[PDB]
Symmetry: C2
Subunit: 446 residues, 2 copies
Amino acid sequence: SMATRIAILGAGPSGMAQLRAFQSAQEKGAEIPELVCFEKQADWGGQWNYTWRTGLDENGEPVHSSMYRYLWSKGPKECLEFADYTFDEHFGKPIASYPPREVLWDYIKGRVEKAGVRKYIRFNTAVRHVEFNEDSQTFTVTVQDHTTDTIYSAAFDYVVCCTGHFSTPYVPEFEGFEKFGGRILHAHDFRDALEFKDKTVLLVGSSYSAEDIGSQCYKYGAKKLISCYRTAPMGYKWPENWDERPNLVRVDTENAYFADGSSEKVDAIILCTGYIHHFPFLNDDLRLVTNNRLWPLNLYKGVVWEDNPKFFYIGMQDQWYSFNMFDAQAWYARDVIMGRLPLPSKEEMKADSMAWREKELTLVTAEEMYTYQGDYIQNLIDMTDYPSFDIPATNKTFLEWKHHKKENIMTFRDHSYRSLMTGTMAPKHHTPWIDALDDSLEAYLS
Amino acid sequence: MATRIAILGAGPSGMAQLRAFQSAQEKGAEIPELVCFEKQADWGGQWNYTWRTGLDENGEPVHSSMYRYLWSKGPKECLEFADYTFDEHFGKPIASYPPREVLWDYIKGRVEKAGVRKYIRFNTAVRHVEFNEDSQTFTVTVQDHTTDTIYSAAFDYVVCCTGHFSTPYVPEFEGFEKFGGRILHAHDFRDALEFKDKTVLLVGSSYSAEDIGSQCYKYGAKKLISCYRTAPMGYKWPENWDERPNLVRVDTENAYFADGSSEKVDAIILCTGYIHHFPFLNDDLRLVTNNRLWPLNLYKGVVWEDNPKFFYIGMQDQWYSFNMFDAQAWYARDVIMGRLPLPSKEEMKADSMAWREKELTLVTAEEMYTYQGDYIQNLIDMTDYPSFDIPATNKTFLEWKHHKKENIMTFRDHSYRSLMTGTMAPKHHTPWIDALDDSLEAYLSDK
Ligand SMILES: Cc1cc2nc3c(=O)[nH]c(=O)nc-3n(C[C@H](O)[C@H](O)[C@H](O)COP(=O)(O)OP(=O)(O)OC[C@H]3O[C@@H](n4cnc5c(N)ncnc54)[C@H](O)[C@@H]3O)c2cc1C
Ligand SMILES: Cc1cc2nc3c(=O)[nH]c(=O)nc-3n(C[C@H](O)[C@H](O)[C@H](O)COP(=O)(O)OP(=O)(O)OC[C@H]3O[C@@H](n4cnc5c(N)ncnc54)[C@H](O)[C@@H]3O)c2cc1C
């Protein structure tokens, strides 16, 4: 109805938030651009759409989801609630604070099922190339539609990139991998923990993947777990059959050797070494290059590409906050696309981003980090009609979560926190984490 | 010479393409400028083994489907280069079914001698090829992973040598989303010892199934089941390996089959083939076909009929391999160089149709490899590729077929005669089943 045409790449949480932002503005009576969203999977959800598939999907594209069986929320759900679609509204009842994948998946779909935005999406279509033409001032987006096996392009006035940054593995090599006889994989290819039942598992890395894949491995009966770190130990007090050591240095037919001179028989090695920002459809003029951090550079307000401000990136930061961060972002992007918030000059954009980067470098403690992100989110929601929830109250919730993890890393998921949107407190779940062997939504909600 | 060629990939076909040009210039011709792009850090293609699975370190798809303990699948006598013999490379006779590392060494040998490595830009992935109608040139856009830059270059011709056995065809079966063992495609199979003392289901009834089964067996898998969609492999298997009708569904631990059987299974390996997948090509340049002896739209099986400045090498199914690619690369070379002019689109189409009509006739393995030999024969008669004896190579194939029928676990223990040198291969020092060391070093010593 407005003259322009927008392309949204990806229908993960960020892609869905972006459609939702437009749908919301129009429901309040605005005229909005034409929307096309492209998604390579057959259904929306992004990471949350679980697949048994590993490696390359059935059309030959990279498998996107890194999620595995038995995965549950990693932080209080109370911290990732939508300000415009509460947990109360979706579920009709109170539920525990750390829901399984399927439940959280259900929740986010619910919002966009209600919004009726599914119709903007062309599923099973992979983005191949985006180019900007200087003379028309438009982007040409080329895609492959895998349902018809045709490749075609279309012209757009703005492009919002919502393709995530936790799907292309960073996989470093260690000496002797070419002759190790057990399995080597990246966290990205981890599926069923029962595959590692009665086995000795090495996890390389000291971040969330290593904490969590370790825990699932443990909880489903891995015989022994070794996890090893490059910089500093995770530092949690692990179960009896799990130990932390200095980094792996080499491997041979059955054995792993470590930097402290230890050595051990190992059955499988899981690289929990993170991901890279990888945009294979973008040229150097549009393509973001960064490591995982709270403040990537060259994004104004963390979302506008400074070299071509008709291009936007959603959710490319590291994530303490997640779902409502993407909303705050998508709402911003929407508003600038729609002319409601004009942009400053390239010089001020750069100055502003530099200030944000300066402060990022200041940050030492987990507490400072999520607060920094809250400060960021706060800035965004103040500029748009996103409902402004209570950021400091969400920070306390993060703080409590931090503590519970320290107390006992195996039972942090058994606690409860209060919604910052509704005020409702979460009930205890009906089963302790360690004993809830059934990841299904059906079991979680009975 | 005025023009500029882009060669995509430095596997056996890419290397053959470089070698054809180098050869022509060694006999005194002026050749085009050459750029070859390879995404891996070394040449060899499938033969360059990687422990990596899924996506490689730059984020590109892992290319090699090869696994530890792999050896040649047919007589080496059948895949010898007519211009670089096994005798010349190795300085001695060797057995007929060499390991991966040994064949790898042999093909690199030819191009190390030719000095063509300097044309290649390694660690560079091809992203897009476009043809511009107004300049009549191709713009090839690539990412260099050493510098992390994306750039383009203009070319007059493009030869595509990126292979067709690297993007898995992976079908879904009911209940995969809840099975608790591993699911993988043959593409991701690396060490057989990962399946020691385990029960392994192999879905499929072709070469991957035969060979991944055999490796699994030979390295001590407890039990093997292999199931087929159309017809059984039909070989007489070991005692802990059986063939059944197709898998229908799966649950937490169990596999159920079409004949009503059911079994506890540890790992499922899909041995279901690959797809021709060219993610850098638009519909005007992109070949779409299933695995076969005669894909359609390739004139002489190499020239893209819709834009004859674009060429495809090694896109057929492979009885013959390495010297088929040479026959082709030499043909492509000669057309690109002006030595062989092309007919009209109409005759290209008519000729291709005739070849396809015959491909539909083929029933027996013997007819199939003979067809391919007829095809190869046609190509080498048009270029100065040395014409070896195709009928003699056909016999070798035929003997190989027999040995496989007699005993599927000892076909690799036989020996055949080179069709290039006449030399007969010696017996290997170790029976296949007992040769647990896949290394070049072990294969070439005398114990
Ligand atoms: C293993 C794991 C566990 C996590 N757990 C939690 C958690 O418990 N809590 C939490 O808050 N966050 C968690 N996260 C963070 C997660 O990043 C966010 O929750 C959320 O998934 C961000 O979604 P997104 O839309 O930005 O990207 P994604 O969820 O990755 O989705 C991006 C979309 O882009 C599509 N796409 C990509 N490339 C193309 C292409 N070339 N063409 C077409 N479409 C394309 C993908 O198919 C996908 O649908 C987890 C992440 C991982 C990897
Ligand atoms: C598991 C397996 C076992 C086999 N065993 C035998 C055997 O024993 N005997 C036999 O005769 N044949 C065998 N083959 C057949 C095999 O196809 C040929 O031997 C030979 O490897 C074909 O070489 P190629 O150059 O055509 O393709 P490939 O060997 O696949 O090489 C193609 C090259 O293209 C490069 N490439 C692809 N995409 C890009 C890109 N986008 N950008 C840059 N570079 C790219 C690749 O990295 C690779 O180097 C086997 C095949 C498989 C899968």
